[PDB]
Amino acid sequence: LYRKYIEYPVLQKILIGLILGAIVGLILGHYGYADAVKTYVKPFGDLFVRLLKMLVMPIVFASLVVGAASISPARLGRVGVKIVVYYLLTSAFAVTLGIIMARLFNPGAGIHLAVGGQQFQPKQAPPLVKILLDIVPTNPFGALANGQVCPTIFFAIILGIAITYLMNSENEKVRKSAETLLDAINGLAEAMYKIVNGVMQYAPIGVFALIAYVMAEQGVKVVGELAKVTAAVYVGLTLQILLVYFVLLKIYGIDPISFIKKAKDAMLTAFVTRSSSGTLPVTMRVAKEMGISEGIYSFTLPLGATINMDGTALYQGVSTFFIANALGSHLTVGQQLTIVLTAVLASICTAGVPGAGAIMLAMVLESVGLPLTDPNVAAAYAMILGIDAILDMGRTMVNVTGDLTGTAIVAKTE
Ligand SMILES: N[C@@H](CC(=O)O)C(=O)O
């Protein structure tokens, strides 16, 4: 409780809890009595997970309403077309590379990391037609509460475009009312951010508890796959950086070395801060240094940062393959491309704050193939959750660099 605790700024603090916990969990004989560590520690971690889920739902709604309504109807045009194409193609290629890398490493298992035995293939997922139908909400509040992310996305975009056509109308009462509504929702969003900042400080203890249980449960071989898949992701990320950007910058006429030189400044703050939003003003400064047009970067940067996320999509595909191979599941081609589409939609919906990235994974699993209710699935989810902390660090810099690439390419064409 003592203030100095909250005064230590180092995000390295989290890693402290990562290390100190694992050691204790690693010591099976004198400390790692599975039953006692289980009963005592597990709830401290479930508390962190439970708290983490709370942040997700309203942030999506408020951020999308404000951003879409303020940004898109105003500038809507061919610039929007090129940007949308770029973002969607990048998401697709990112998930493609994640799949290819899971094929290359095969990180998931040497022997089934979950106990298997009841790995029997899951209940068949619905065909694509009903998935696409679901994207539109059968009822807004009913689907909002129950626990569905995407239809809230739809409804929010709708409401925002509506308001934006609205405020321009003549009658003053209408303009005033719309303004008040918008401001209220924006205030809600700011509040949720302020809460995120706080939760981050409790996070370390939860990391400590979760990883301690993970280590003490299975012991030595949980770290064999864990690092393997870890590297599988990191390489998969670097490739995305090298091939995608160097090609594009090369094609349109920027020498990539100087580009990354310039970006390193923002990438440092993205990696260590573990958050995408605060970098956005740093991104605007970097663009002003990069030689990019004001209206274009002012339109694109917020919209890209909220909408477009590629590194997280690769992380989700690779984590999905991890789960599948740990459970004792093997994925057919149709299921693979279905994962492609579903992960595209999930990366689109993703929130944009540190931990949220894991949560949307639960969506893809539920949308296709493996349901979450099977205990082995949650068991492996627990293993993922720990390393997610470090993986997010590189995912942040990847996403920011991709958005910068998009804006600089568009501006260079014009
Ligand atoms: N906000 C994270 C992703 C996430 O947590 O969903 C990032 O930018 O890397």
Swiss-Prot record:
Keywords: Amino-acid transport, Cell membrane, Chloride, Membrane, Metal-binding, Sodium, Symport, Transmembrane, Transmembrane helix, Transport. Na(+) 1 binds at G304, N308, N399, D403. InterPro entries: Na-dicarboxylate_symporter, Na-dicarboxylate_symporter_CS, Na:dicarbo_symporter_sf. It is a multi-pass membrane protein. Changing S63V: Strongly decreased chloride conductance. GO terms for molecular function: amino acid:sodium symporter activity; chloride transmembrane transporter activity; identical protein binding; L-aspartate transmembrane transporter activity; metal ion binding. SUPFAM superfamilies: Proton glutamate symport protein. Na(+) 2 binds at T306, T350. Homotrimer. Belongs to the dicarboxylate/amino acid:cation symporter (DAACS) (TC 2.A.23) family. Sodium-dependent, high-affinity amino acid transporter that mediates aspartate uptake. Has only very low glutamate transport activity. Functions as a symporter that transports one amino acid molecule together with two or three Na(+) ions, resulting in electrogenic transport. Na(+) binding enhances the affinity for aspartate. Mediates Cl(-) flux that is not coupled to amino acid transport; this avoids the accumulation of negative charges due to aspartate and Na(+) symport. In contrast to mammalian homologs, transport does not depend on pH or K(+) ions. This is Glutamate transporter homolog.
